[PDB]
Amino acid sequence: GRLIPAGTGSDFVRFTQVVDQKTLKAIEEARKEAVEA
């Protein structure tokens, strides 16, 4: 009753994320914040 090995259930794509250029700059801003003092 597990997901099928074949299809959208491919190790090749089970993992894929999406982004908006807005959320792209927002995450890099989190990286910028990493600079201490």
Least gap, CB of 2 to other proteins (angstroms): 7
**17 or 36, CB closer to other proteins?**
17
Specify the residue, 11 or 36, whose C-beta has the smaller distance to other proteins. 11
d(CA 21, CA 2): 35
Q: Check: CB of residue 3 under 8 Å from CB of residue 9.
A: yes
Which of 30/35 has CB closer to other proteins? 30
Sign of CA dihedral 8, 12, 15, 20: negative
Residues that bind other proteins (CB under 8 A): 1-24, 26-27, 30
